[PDB]
Design a protein around this ligand. Structure first.
Ligand code: 4A3
Ligand code: 4A3
Ligand code: 4A3
Ligand code: 4A3
Ligand code: 4A3
Ligand code: 4A3
Ligand code: 4A3
Ligand code: 4A3
Length: 352
């Protein structure tokens, strides 16, 4: 822990925690291929349990980065293609609006206005089919981006079908295990209960509610160590020994669509480095997309990032491959996104 990293981190995070009243927080800075860990406050306020390097936080939508890489791994395996129609992997999807909707569209929120959430009442596999069959698109496929758990969530479920594995089995065996993420869970086991932090929404202790496609969209829990390892894996994919995982990370960081200065990958979102901080610092934001023809392979000169939130948690991951530099910020309160990106910006810009 060099003093350069120590001082900038404590100078940035301490005021953030006070200003946002965050009960507990874990931060990892990846600098020249080594992680540096920082922890504040409480994982459990009532039981006085401190945040540590073993504390599990809910990642929220940062889960979509694991989903995107797993999908990319399936592509590398020759099991799926992003150009394949959705109907190829779900033939019961016989409704005529699904003509021309591909796995890429699901992965990148460009199917034509799939809703932010799968409705809470949708539970069975029959419910899900009925839900997607009855969905009426607002736009043609590949024309507008509308962020949606029902879009990326379905991509994840369909992407693992040719493997013959469940999503959870696929993620564990193809992403978690090979990358040594031994404390990253879709479902937290009883042995890990003590490490599992409580989230805090308006003073109330809360964990993420179960739902359809939760594992695929927002259900991963992890520690600051594993997330630091996840960042390193994404910083330097070609150092990973697994052939298809290496390629799947690169596919997930490819630029498929452009909306202004933002580029949409699989899970990951990117901007050209150097980034105007104002470009990175609303319930529904429909944005027209420019197709990148063909998609640009993972650009090392990039700000790659993803925000995530659940009711009780707020997370943020950001990295710059070119600089071998990254940050993970995990907190057990859902606080404003600009505050996360600002703090991350302050730290990484000081270190680059
Ligand atoms: N809202 C729309 C939905 C689908 C199509 C299409 O061409 O498939 C076009 C639209 O304007
Ligand atoms: N291991 C655990 C799994 C689920 C929950 C929950 O609150 O849903 C809590 C746990 O400690
Ligand atoms: N005992 C507690 C005190 C304060 C808070 C809070 O969220 O500020 C939560 C608690 O469970
Ligand atoms: N309460 C729940 C609602 C939906 C689902 C699901 O798998 O869709 C699971 C649940 O435990
Ligand atoms: N062009 C490059 C691609 C990947 C890596 C790596 O470390 O994975 C490094 C590079 O210079
Ligand atoms: N590293 C950077 C510093 C300052 C600015 C700016 O727009 O002021 C942008 C950057 O990418
Ligand atoms: N200060 C900056 C202004 C514009 C851009 C850009 O990529 O358009 C980047 C910057 O660092
Ligand atoms: N997208 C979601 C975010 C938060 C929660 C929660 O239960 O806190 C559930 C979701 O389906």
């Amino acid at each position: 822990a060099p003093q350069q990293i120590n001082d900038i981190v404590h100078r940035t995070i301490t005021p953030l925690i006070e200003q946002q009243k965050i009960p507990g927080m874990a931060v990892a800075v990846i600098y020249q291929g080594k992680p540096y860990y920082f922890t504040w406050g409480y994982a459990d306020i009532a039981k006085k349990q401190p945040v540590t390097q073993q504390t599990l936080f809910e990642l929220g939508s940062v889960s979509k980065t694991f989903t995107g890489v797993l999908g990319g791994d399936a592509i590398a395996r020759g099991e799926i293609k992003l150009s394949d129609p959705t109907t190829k992997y779900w033939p019961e999807l016989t409704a005529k609006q699904w003509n021309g909707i591909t796995l890429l569209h699901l992965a990148t929120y460009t199917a034509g206005g799939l809703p932010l959430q799968v409705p809470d009442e949708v539970k069975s596999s029959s419910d899900l089919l009925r839900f997607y069959q009855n969905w009426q698109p607002a736009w043609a496929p590949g024309t507008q981006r509308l962020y949606a758990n029902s879009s990326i969530g379905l991509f994840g479920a369909l992407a693992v079908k040719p493997s013959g594995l469940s999503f959870e089995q696929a993620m564990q065996t193809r992403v978690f295990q090979p990358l040594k993420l031994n404390h990253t869970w879709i479902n937290v086991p009883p042995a890990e209960e003590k490490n599992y932090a409580w989230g805090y929404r308006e003073g109330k202790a809360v964990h993420v509610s179960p739902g359809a496609l939760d594992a695929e969209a927002y259900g991963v829990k992890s520690t600051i160590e594993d997330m630091a390892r996840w960042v390193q894996s994404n910083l330097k994919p070609l150092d990973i020994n697994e052939k298809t995982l290496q390629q799947g990370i690169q596919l997930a960081q490819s630029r498929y669509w452009q909306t202004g200065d933002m580029y949409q990958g699989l899970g990951w979102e990117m901007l050209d480095w150097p980034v105007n901080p104002d470009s990175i610092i609303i319930a529904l934001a429909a944005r027209p997309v420019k197709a990148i023809t063909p998609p640009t392979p993972a650009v090392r000169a990039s700000w790659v990032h993803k925000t995530g939130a659940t009711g009780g948690f707020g997370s943020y991951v950001a990295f710059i491959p070119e600089k071998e530099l990254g940050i993970v910020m995990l907190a057990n309160k859902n606080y404003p996104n600009p505050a996360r990106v600002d703090a991350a910006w302050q730290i990484l810009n000081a270190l680059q």
